[model samples]
Target: SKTINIRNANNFIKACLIRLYTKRGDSVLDLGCGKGGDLLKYERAGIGEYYGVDIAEVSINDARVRARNMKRRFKVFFRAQDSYGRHMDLGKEFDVISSQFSFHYAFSTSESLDIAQRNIARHLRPGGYFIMTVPSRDVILERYKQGRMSNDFYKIELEKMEDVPMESVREYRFTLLDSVNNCIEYFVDFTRMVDGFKRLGLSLVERKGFIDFYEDEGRRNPELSKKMGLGCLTREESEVVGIYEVVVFRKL
Candidate 1:
């Protein structure tokens, strides 16, 4: 099971690194590093230092095995910390802190990002970069593509199961009560992410793609891109058409 996910992960890491931090020899911390494939990539890419942290002890142990086998100086560690908290004792700072799709698992999305900012800023030297690849606001529906849907139009019954209601907004915990095996998924609003980042005193350094208003074979169906906006490009296509944006932030 772990090895099966590596194929998709390898593609994701290659895509992210090739765009954001193409340079080598930088010290990197793979926050929420699962199974350690990205950590291996960083080590092989000439990163001077590589560290991986996860909440799962068994997963971290599995990652350690990979590091040892590769003869890489990766220090895989774990703590009882979830996405909503920081609990690693990585005394030294880092040049780049990267998180893949794990960022969204936090109990509170905004609070999770704030924690990321706080931890990254404390452990990252000035001008260092904090990077993360999260599920885009458009990713919710796109994930349904992977599901077995009888037809495009089907009922997706959502039920409130577990959610905290904030003072400002009424947030309800929702669960997929039932679905057509693959009904469309809804997205977290884009504004929510931007606002959360702004509150963290972070600024967007670059947005990979905003609008898909072009006709190229290299691009996906314009109608689809138009419908999905800059949020629904495939892992590879996101590079050219800018669907899944790789966010880069610097601590001031």
Candidate 2:
């Protein structure tokens, strides 16, 4: 018996978000845009213009290759910057800003996170929206308390879970079976994230766990759910999915 692949499930939720948060012809910015994974998704959504930024120049290069091979025509640009504590000048603003599974990298410090947040808000047009999916803080802490956070295909290994100064970095090894291996990642405080963005002219639209999002949007977009096989996730996939949350925000 085969199971729904975890990567597909992750991609599907992003598709659902692109459907929910953007309109045809809306401009978009993808922060930490790893190898342009969502380029095709943005293309399918009929984005008018696109901007991408990532830390690795090679990732940016491959993104450009993907954009070159895209079937539809749209204005696109990408840059590589180690934008940890500085501005990311893509020289354009957009109607939508999206970060997926990558925002936590900036959680290394208060100043770093602020710089990352400003980059997102500063380039977004008022009334446009921002969408993101990240590991849930509550779930990470709960799992860490048990001393065993590894299921079949994913793991989170850390000497400790929190810092004396919460804004300071809390780094650990993360793995996703064969897809990702020993990637260093950081944790973001859920409450603090919401509060910080709120202070930066972004308002919450919806925040839901992966399971809850599946039940909600999967019902609302049943055709998509069935097509994406979101209902057929294996036990391992479900376990991994349960640890994450999809969040959306609108500029005020």
Candidate 3:
């Protein structure tokens, strides 16, 4: 059941990511754009220019190869660099910057996280959009309460904030072990994420839980929704057990 839930969560997240496209011909910057998996999606959406940055050289090279094979009319660029590092030399801005499942990695430290935020701010044009998906603290808490996460090896710990606003934001640190590898992951309350965006001069466009978007999609097109892996449980159950969220913000 846990594995099924994880798979359903992944499907919903991907559905949201593809649905968050902007206007045609808008330039896009993809942070942590591994293997350029989304390049085809951008092309289908009629994006005019695409820039992707990833830490893996092999992945970037593969993306470049794929781009070349596509013979696209639009401009495409991929760079290999640590996105959290201060030395980003790409001298251009974009209409949209998407981090997908990768932005939370910057939570390594406050300084590194700040650097990532500033980079997102610096690279986006005014009124440009930033879209991302992340693990939701609410979902994790609910999972723990239901005893679904009973395995000691997979237990998640919520670190109590000693001297901060507790109502609006909560912090948790947990280790995520999957088929790829085991790694530490961090999740802060969605309100805290909004606070970060506000401090960085970004305005909220829309903030929706995974179930919110999934249910809306089902309403809009039942046939497509059926294909989107959204029927794992009843609509209300889906909402209660969702593992991620989609947030869209515009640079102010």
Candidate 4:
């Protein structure tokens, strides 16, 4: 994994997402569809219907422009709405919903998570899948122990947040450095994240670490493995593998 770049890592996970969850004519609902970055991917996958929602109007407009520019054949729609605070109804059920790195924001509070999860459950057809990637608590602790402190190191201070109860949900803050510099994102404790899914009538189907994702999938499909830049990566590094996690759940 020494040679792995951010793009390589990202596209590699997306490859897994597409391979594991998507199929021909599957309608997709993309949450936090920023500037339509995944638009081309869904188009390439031949998804029958593509719907995207985001809080920013400008991003939606940009997505629309990109959609027009591509002249894609599939049905595509973009809406601007606060996916967390406002009630979201795309007027149709989806076969697959993708949240990627943005799903954590929906859990800002207990009430918010309840609203988001219920709405998600309502939008998904029976047996539909929800695929997402988020930061892992294991990774954060591992990094923190190594004195890699800046963003990954933080105390688990769940008692302060009034909205989150101590016993049911465990939340932790992880600082991250994005384009704008530094920011904080709260991550659901991975060990208990599936409880949220179970409560919302979803069942965990699969979960994989960053390295296992590439290695296992690479063995299954050599061509796709190389295309995703996963063919040449090492698999023994625990620190490298634990950085992120891919979770797949089925709506029950």
Best by TM-score: 2
What is candidate 3's lDDT per residue for 57-117, written digit by digit as tens?
Answer: 9979988989989857689988999886555757888998998777777776667777887
Write down the RMSD of all candidates, one decimal each: 8.7, 2.7, 4.4, 4.5
State which candidate, 1 or 2, has the greater lDDT.
2
**lDDT, candidate 2, 1-252, per-residue tens:** 223466777788888888888888989988889888998888878888888888989989988998888785678878888555677767667899989888888788878988888888888899999899988877776777786588877898764435454234367778877666888777877777778889999988888887777667777987877776566577777888887889998999
For candidate 4, lDDT tens digit of each residue in 87-160? 88877889999887777777687777767777778899999998988767666655555765342222223225
Clashing pairs in 1: 162-173
* Cα lDDT tens digits for candidate 1, 1-252: 212222333244344442356356677777777777675456555676777777787878887777767866544444334533654457877787777655555425556556655666677666777776543444333433454211222222322435532223212222222311432233334566566666665566754322222222115433433332223334333332222345667655
| Alpha-carbon shift of residue 189 in model 1 (angstroms) | 5.1
Off by more than 4 A, model 1: 1-19, 71-80, 86-89, 107-113, 139-190, 199-201, 209-245
The predicted structure with the larger TM-score, 2 or 3, is 2
> If ranked by TM-score, best first, what sequence of candidates would result?
2, 4, 3, 1
Q: Under the 3 Å rule for N, CA and C atoms, how many clashes does model 1 have?
A: 1
When 1 and 2 are scored with TM-score, the better candidate is: 2
Quality of model 4 by C-alpha lDDT? 0.71
Model 4 TM-score on a 0 to 1 scale: 0.81
Question: Candidate 3: where are CA atoms >4 Å away?
Answer: 1-18, 71-73, 150-178, 222-241
TM-scores vs. true structure, each candidate: 0.60, 0.90, 0.77, 0.81
lDDT of each: 0.51, 0.80, 0.71, 0.71
